[PDB]
């Protein structure tokens, strides 16, 4: 049977899965009919990208998802669009956001307490 499953990639102790479509008989990390998405669980709020159109097409043509892919489709909302069920459909929370340029401009100007806690550490060496 055609399956929608996870193809493991990455390093030792660092898995990244490719949500792919292949038949059951094929080996886990092998040729796939189509690559649908990716799933990085090692990362914070695991990354879950699923191509909605393609996954809907494959579900409608009769590909059988593995339980993991069912969980991912529940989170992406595709498991509700196909086989309509009352599920929370918790579209992935974003894994927050850092920045660099704003912090650099903030500190370049920070000055003040930069050299200020700096002469405070001067007083510290005094204490040292």
């Amino acid at each position: 049977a055609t399956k929608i499953r996870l193809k493991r990639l990455g390093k030792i102790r660092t898995p990244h899965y490719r949500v792919v479509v292949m038949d059951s008989r094929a080996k886990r990390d092998g040729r796939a009919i189509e690559e649908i998405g990716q799933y990085h669980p090692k990362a914070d709020p695991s990354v879950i990208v699923i191509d909605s159109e393609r996954v809907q097409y494959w579900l409608g043509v009769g590909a059988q998802p593995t339980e993991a892919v069912v969980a991912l489709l529940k989170r992406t909302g595709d498991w509700q669009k196909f086989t309509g069920d009352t599920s929370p459909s918790g579209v992935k929370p974003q894994p927050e956001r850092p920045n660099k340029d704003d912090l650099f401009n903030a500190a370049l100007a920070e000055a003040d307490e930069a050299p200020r806690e700096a002469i405070t550490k001067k007083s510290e060496g005094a204490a040292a």
Binding site: K100, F104, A107, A114, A118, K121, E124, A128
Partner: protein, 200 residues
């Protein structure tokens, strides 16, 4: 995996001051050893190799890693010597040295490998950490009162900080304005000679 032997011997052999001044380099015009005062032929290889070794012993980088730097610079677009010197200057220990928080690059390597420094919030103990633009190197809060740190705080005014770095001495904070350019790295080797050497 680190040169721990004397540096004045290497400076005398290479003919230039690898670091510091006003020292045993008063015996400069001749390399170390019994056969130092003799006249030399100096082939092209000799010359090239001298430039490469000067850069290596100046920056505290061994041959495999220096070679890796060379292929990275060669692949990069622009002048190969410019990119190579830019990489070597972007090394974190050299960044600490140039900012002036360390007396020498060896001291900078010591403190960096011992972890007295924070890179934009994250602790780094890798001397070869390539600092990127707009980065913020910080002294570890526990180690803001190191004796070498206070010596640097006493002496930095004499030291010249390059234009591509901003330093809050008393605060221990090195802001990286931009990744330096050849006109900003001090000219003390022949990067062109090094590039020619790595082609034979």
């Amino acid at each position: 995996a680190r040169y721990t032997g004397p540096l004045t011997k290497k400076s005398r052999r290479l003919g230039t001051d690898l670091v510091g001044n006003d020292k045993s380099f008063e015996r400069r015009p001749y390399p170390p050893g019994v056969h130092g005062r003799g006249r030399t032929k100096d082939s092209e290889y000799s010359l090239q190799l001298r430039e490469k070794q000067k850069a290596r012993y100046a920056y505290g980088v061994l041959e495999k890693q220096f070679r890796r730097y060379y292929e990275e610079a060669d692949r990069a677009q622009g002048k190969t010597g410019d990119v190579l010197l830019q990489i070597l200057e972007s090394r974190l220990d050299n960044v600490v040295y140039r900012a002036g928080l360390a007396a020498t690059r060896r001291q900078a390597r010591q403190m960096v490998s011992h972890g007295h420094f924070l890179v934009n919030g994250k602790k780094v103990n890798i001397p070869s950490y390539r600092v990127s633009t707009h980065d913020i190197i910080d002294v570890r809060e526990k180690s803001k009162d190191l004796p070498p740190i206070v010596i640097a705080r006493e002496t930095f005014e004499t030291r010249d900080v390059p234009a591509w770095l901003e330093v809050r001495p008393n605060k221990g904070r090195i802001l990286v304005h931009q990744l330096p350019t050849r006109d900003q790295i001090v000219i003390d080797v022949n990067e062109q000679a090094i590039v020619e050497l790595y082609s034979k």
